[PDB]
Design a protein around this nucleic acid. Structure first.
Ligand code: MG
Ligand code: MG
Lengths: 104, 72, 98, 55, 55, 171, 67
RNA sequence: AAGGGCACCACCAGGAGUGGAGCCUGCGGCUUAAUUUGACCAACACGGGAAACCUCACCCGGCCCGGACACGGACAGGAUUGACAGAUUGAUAGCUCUUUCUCGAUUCCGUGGGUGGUGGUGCAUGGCCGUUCUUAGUUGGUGGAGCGAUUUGUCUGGUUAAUUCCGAUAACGAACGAGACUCUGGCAUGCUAACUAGUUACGCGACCCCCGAGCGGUCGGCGUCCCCCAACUUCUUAGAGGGACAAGUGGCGUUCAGCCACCCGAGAUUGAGCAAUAACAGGUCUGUGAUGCCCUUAGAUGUCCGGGGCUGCACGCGCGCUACACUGACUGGCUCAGCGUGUGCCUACCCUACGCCGGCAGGCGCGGGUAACCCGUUGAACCCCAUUCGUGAUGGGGAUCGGGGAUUGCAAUUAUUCCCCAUGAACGAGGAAUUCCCAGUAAGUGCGGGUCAUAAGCUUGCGUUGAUUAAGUCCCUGCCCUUUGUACACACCGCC
């Protein structure tokens, strides 16, 4: 054997993360492997407030830059061994994956 | 929240929970005869206050106030 | 300028093992990230390959804070006669598995 | 005398250079190369060491 | 020049131990999130890195 | 893990790497019609694809330059032998790349072409290649101390709002 | 500018002749009047410089002096 | 010059203030070896500029070439490279001197030629940014007027935040900007989910109870993904969607564009980002391996090291902090947040729970966290509840100054910072003047980030408590449009 894994999805844009979550959930259900829904970590917002001007002149204009990190956890539970049952990554640029053991 | 915000949250939580419990399990006609009392006293007892806050801007201390400027 | 002979041949033989060689622009770095076992710092790497570029044997490109020296055809033959190599040894960039 | 004590001009629109002025005046009406156009323009080592140190 | 004092002065910390990874400038250095990037340079490469002005 | 890095610093590190790689490929392939670069990173390997107008020039003599570039980015960025790859792709409709047109305009001016003739030539080519509008501005000094800014625009153009981000390509 | 001090004369090497600090006798007997610094990295090739009151190997073979 | 229009960087009606006092900081002046320098609404807590070293660009000294390459010399019988001891120097810089070794073609000398520069010029430039201006303005096609440049369209008027629209109307149909757009906030007991968020129910408990409550009460006590051994998403997280449109009613109005009020509704004007044609000889060469030209280039304006300075004070100005007190201060108790950071390529520097030692600043041993897993249920402040003080420059205020103890750093003196005990100065609501501002706003009030080895009176955000006055006008201050005059067109900083 009974093996369970936790696949962690991380992306900077919502649509790429949603697509990988969708077709991985669909693939797991097609293989009749019971799967938990993608739970979402709160978005990591990297904010940097610099000054627009490259010099000291201006009207103290400050620029705000945002970077959003979206995180999802999907749990795969199979009565048999699991790594051989699912052997596809189905990824696109802009999103990364990491697979861990459910106990680990 | 703070002290006052917890107070207002508590009182409208009591009112909203009781009016919804009355709606769910007994007649809403008798729900209305206490619901009309609550609204005719204070609308905030059943409806949350939408106003929360305003973002701070880079020209002054607060949301709208600007810093002192001098010409001389 | 002044380098030991073992230092010059170590840099040259790496420039022929692969035709390219990067070097962070920090003259005070105690050791080059590559060939650190040969005990020659990044400064001597800088001046040796800027002398190659001045003679025309290598082309110099600069990114943010790194050099991207590219060995040329003219520099290939000079390395052959400098290190006493036959006209059969070629860099990996010039020839791979061919 | 065109500057104050700090060194700022009291007349910015008074061109302090003889060759140029405030407005850009074209050279020869905008003809010739390297200039703005005109209406006419509009119309292996390791294995060698291996055999070297084997003996 | 001499090895004893050419780099003797310790710079394990302070403003002079850090320079921009793009242009070696030691001023206005943004070290947040391990950026270690000169300020005007980060403004130049803001979109390429991934930071986008949402508001 | 103490060896690993936090996700926020990891994405920032990838952004710095992509910016440095894009800038270096710009400074090297500017004469070779360089347009852009995209990377697809997986833990097994990374694929670096360079979009250029002339892939026949990006490739060296029998592919020498591509091997040269993939080796030199490997040495700089510390990649393993198998985790670094390098492909080149011809950019369709090269007149619709603002970077490609900017490079060709630089080449024409370096040749010595008049500003009006070069700018009108590239402006026409963008239009028949298919666009809702375009605009080129050339600023600096030519033959004199005073500088000038010449503007050449046609078609429709937008400046404000979110649409300008995915409608107007600026270079 | 206007340096009050004078230009400092950098050291000029003596440009000395051939070493010739050891000879032979009685149809050839090798005899060295210069010491040897016996460290392993110093080697037997190098010779310790003899001074008025001290011995100093050419490499960093320490310095042995007689007090 | 006249007429219209708009604006809390204009006023009205007011609020908090600044200007008065001390101190922090930035400018000017003075002094200095240097007190580096740019900048004069749109300079003056600005260059993210909180500088002990570095930073540093300034002053006083001292190393090195990191002056490529080409050519001519000298050279394995030596071109040359380092160095122990003494002196010499601040220096354990063989910098130099005495002293001889050692290094082995890598250099050295000369002639050309590189190179670098936080050196000058932003009045040579690019890019970026500020301002006009975030006001509402700007331009084609066809048609009409013109011989023509040009003009109409783009306007008498009503209306709008908006040439935003409606209306007259030689104009019709458009384009940019405005709007629309993206992010954010408010509602979804509607959907999807969640042991890295939980909530209810149940089982062990632990205590209060027994006047009896007993399906009693509290539990941030333990458990039911310890996977067979409960469900569910209301609360939390975040995706897809919906929701709001002047949509309904009444009134005003050409009864049009629209305006006001009201019911129902979470919401009947949430704040931002972007942002035209163009101009400002506006600021930046000290952000850049962005850059022309000029200067320097070996006794260096390159580069490194030691020390000092950037802080220096008869004085003037600006941004601010603390206060002048009882609507308070002190002491004790009660007690509620949300942004958001967190162990590093170079890079040596993380956030901290727990226990022990000290009165405090702190020190020591054990851990956890690369993070909805740990700090953390962020036990924040104001506020609230009690005691003392009692109109006294008083227990208000904590400047100036003495002594002592700690942390960071190679280095703390010109005090880095912090802590303890001492002194207790002006200041009793501030002249003329002047700034910001319309709802979760002003303001009180703390907490994160950036700067950081040490650090915030700054800045950037977040949260808590939370109002007075106003739904107007051109009176003052500015700007826009139209008309008008012009000998201006380099455009009034003009011409003459
Ligand atoms: Mg808009
Ligand atoms: Mg005291």
């Amino acid at each position: 054997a009974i093996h369970r894994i936790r696949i962690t999805l991380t992306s900077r844009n919502v649509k790429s993360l949603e697509k990988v979550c969708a077709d991985l959930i669909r693939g797991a259900k097609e293989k009749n492997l019971k799967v938990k829904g993608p739970v979402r970590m709160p978005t990591k917002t990297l904010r940097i407030t610099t000054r627009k001007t490259p010099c000291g002149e201006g009207s103290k204009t400050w620029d705000r830059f945002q970077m959003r990190i979206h995180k999802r956890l999907i749990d795969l539970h199979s009565p048999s061994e699991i790594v051989k049952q699912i052997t596809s990554i189905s990824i696109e640029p802009g999103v990364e994956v990491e697979v861990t053991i459910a106990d680990a | 929240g703070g002290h006052v915000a917890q107070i207002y949250a508590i009182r409208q939580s009591i009112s909203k929970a009781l009016v919804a419990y009355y709606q769910k399990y007994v007649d809403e006609a008798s729900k209305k005869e206490i619901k009309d009392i609550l609204i005719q006293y204070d609308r905030t007892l059943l409806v949350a206050d939408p106003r929360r806050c305003e973002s701070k801007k880079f020209g002054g201390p607060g949301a709208r106030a600007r810093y002192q400027k001098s010409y001389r | 300028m002044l380098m030991p002979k073992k230092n010059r041949i170590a840099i040259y033989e790496l420039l022929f093992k692969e035709g390219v060689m990067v070097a962070k622009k920090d003259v005070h770095m105690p050791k080059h990230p590559e060939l650190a076992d040969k005990n020659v710092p990044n400064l001597h790497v800088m001046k040796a390959m800027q002398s190659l570029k001045s003679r025309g044997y290598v082309k110099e490109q600069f990114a943010w804070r790194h050099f991207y020296w590219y060995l040329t055809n003219e520099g290939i033959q000079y390395l052959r006669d400098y290190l006493h190599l036959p006209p059969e040894i070629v860099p990996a960039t010039l020839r791979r598995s061919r | 005398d065109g500057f104050d004590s700090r060194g700022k001009r009291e007349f910015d629109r008074h061109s302090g250079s003889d060759r140029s002025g405030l407005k850009h005046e074209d050279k020869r009406g905008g003809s010739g190369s390297h200039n703005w156009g005109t209406v006419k323009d509009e119309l292996t080592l390791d294995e060698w060491k291996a055999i070297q140190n084997k003996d | 020049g001499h090895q004893q004092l050419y780099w003797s002065h310790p710079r394990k910390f302070g403003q002079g131990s850090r320079s921009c990874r793009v242009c070696s400038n030691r001023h206005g250095l943004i070290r947040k999130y391990g950026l270690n990037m000169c300020r005007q340079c980060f403004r130049q490469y803001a979109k390429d890195i991934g930071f986008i002005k949402l508001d | 893990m103490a060896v690993q890095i936090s996700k926020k610093r990891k994405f920032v590190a990838d952004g710095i790497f992509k910016a440095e790689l894009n800038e270096f490929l710009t400074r090297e392939l500017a004469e070779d019609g360089y347009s852009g670069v995209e990377v697809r990173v997986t833990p097994t390997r990374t694929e670096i694809i360079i979009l250029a107008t002339r892939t026949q020039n990006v490739l060296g003599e029998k592919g020498r330059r591509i091997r040269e570039l993939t080796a030199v980015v490997q040495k700089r960025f510390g990649f393993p032998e198998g985790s670094v790859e390098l492909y080149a792709e011809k950019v369709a409709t090269r007149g619709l790349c603002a970077i490609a047109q900017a490079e060709s305009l630089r080449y024409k001016l370096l040749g010595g072409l008049a500003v009006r003739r070069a700018c009108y030539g590239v402006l026409r080519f963008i239009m028949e290649s298919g666009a809702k509008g375009c605009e080129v501005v050339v600023s600096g000094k030519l033959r004199g101390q005073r500088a000038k800014s010449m503007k050449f625009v046609d078609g429709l153009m937008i400046h404000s709002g979110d649409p300008v981000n995915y409608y107007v390509d600026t270079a | 500018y206007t340096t009050p001090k004078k230009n400092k004369h950098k050291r000029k090497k003596v440009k000395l002749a051939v070493l010739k600090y050891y000879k032979v006798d009685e149809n050839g007997k090798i005899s060295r009047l210069r010491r040897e610094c016996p460290s392993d990295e110093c080697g037997a090739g190098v010779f310790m410089a003899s001074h008025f009151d001290r011995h100093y190997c050419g490499k960093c073979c320490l310095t042995y002096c007689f007090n």
